[PDB]
Design a binder for this molecule. Structure first.
Ligand SMILES: *[C@@H]1O[C@H](CO)[C@@H](O)[C@H](O)[C@H]1NC(C)=O
Ligand SMILES: O=C(NO)OCc1ccccc1
Ligand SMILES: O=C(NO)OCc1ccccc1
Length: 340
């Protein structure tokens, strides 16, 4: 995939350098995959300054390479990507440190720009001149902070395309490893997101904003609270024992911790009971869709590329082609196909 820096240079990474996207076109295809990278976030001046010292590619385009290799769902090889190998592929780097929510420029009062929500909008607008105008399906995908970003942005992309005069493009979401619980820690998270939203001028989807109201928009960063408010179809991929969830919960085995871990898996499974398109294996891991070996994991005998194909068919239950796949066994690696 080849790098393109945004033509509108007022849409910027944290340090004011232009944001951008990596593209590989497939001219025999009307499917478009736009993938949002992850990588945590920063929520005040001092924490963002630290990230600028040792995580600068997540804050700036000045050092980005001219190309990236497409892997997993972004691969063009059928053996690596049984699902969408012939699609047009787009990788959008995460350089806004705001869970893709921000709408604030650098200024005499702001050391950093937080423009994640505007970066997505501007990528979409510039791609319409490069072939996206002819699309039949636009899949907005993402991992980790990018998976939460899908939940925060998929309906805004759908509204953008309607208002621009493209009502026939079907917008859908794929959220990988971005479905978190605001639960009690094992030893003594929502404070940082509440502060972050104020620091970023962060924006959340309109229906969810109207439910929770002023001061409470942080709620919309949690999948089980924002998902019911969304109109676009969204497929949710989430490990039952996500490593980022456990890190924030201060988990690094006696009875108290055994019960804590079993209760976490049960709660996650409960939040997915009424999510009809979902894939949730009983593994300790983090991210999957752009890993080269994403084809290996299975739930109830069905792989993730197969489940996504069954989802495509359902949007035209299906015999032998399931779309809701959630493990019921209660401990990490009770599924034999978990990543080693
Ligand atoms: C460039 O982006 C900024 C910020 O979103 C916007 O206000 C401005 O209208 C854009 N310019 C053009 C020509 O689209
Ligand atoms: O990036 C991560 N972890 O992978 O956190 C993003 C985030 C923070 C708070 C609430 C939802 C999502
Ligand atoms: O609120 C909590 N639990 O204490 O975590 C929420 C969370 C978990 C994982 C990643 C981001 C945000």
């Amino acid at each position: 995939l080849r790098l393109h820096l945004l033509l509108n240079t007022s849409v910027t990474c944290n340090d004011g350098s232009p944001a951008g996207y990596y593209l590989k076109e497939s001219r025999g295809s009307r499917r478009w995959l736009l993938f949002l990278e992850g990588g945590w976030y920063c929520f005040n001046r001092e924490n963002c300054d630290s990230r600028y010292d040792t995580m600068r590619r997540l804050m700036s385009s000045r050092d980005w390479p001219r190309t990236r290799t497409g892997t997993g769902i972004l691969s063009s090889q059928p053996e690596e990507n049984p699902y969408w190998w012939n699609a047009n592929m787009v990788f959008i780097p995460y350089c806004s440190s705001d869970v893709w929510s921000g709408a604030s420029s650098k200024s005499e009062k702001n050391e950093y720009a937080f423009m994640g929500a505007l970066i997505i909008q501007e990528v979409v607008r510039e791609l319409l001149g490069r072939g996206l105008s002819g699309a039949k399906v636009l899949l907005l995908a993402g991992s980790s902070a990018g998976g939460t970003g899908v939940l925060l942005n998929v309906d805004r992309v759908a509204e953008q395309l309607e208002k621009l005069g493209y009502p026939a493009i079907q917008v859908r979401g794929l959220a990988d490893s971005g479905w978190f619980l605001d639960n009690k820690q094992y030893r003594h998270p929502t404070e940082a997101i509440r502060r972050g939203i104020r620091y970023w001028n962060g924006v959340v989807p309109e229906r969810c904003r109207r439910q929770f109201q002023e001061g409470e928009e942080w709620n919309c960063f949690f999948g089980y609270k924002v998902y019911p408010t969304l109109r676009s179809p969204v497929f949710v991929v989430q490990w039952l024992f996500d490593e980022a969830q456990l890190t924030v919960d201060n988990v690094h085995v006696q009875e108290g911790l055994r019960l804590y871990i079993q209760n976490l898996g049960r709660e996650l499974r409960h939040t997915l009971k009424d999510v009809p398109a979902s894939f949730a294996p009983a593994c300790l891991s983090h991210e999957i869709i752009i890993r080269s070996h994403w084809t290996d994991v299975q739930v109830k005998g069905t792989s993730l590329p197969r489940a996504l194909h069954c989802w495509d068919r359902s949007l035209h239950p299906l015999k032998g082609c399931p779309v809701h796949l959630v493990d019921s066994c209660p401990w990490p690696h009770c599924n034999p196909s978990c990543p080693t």
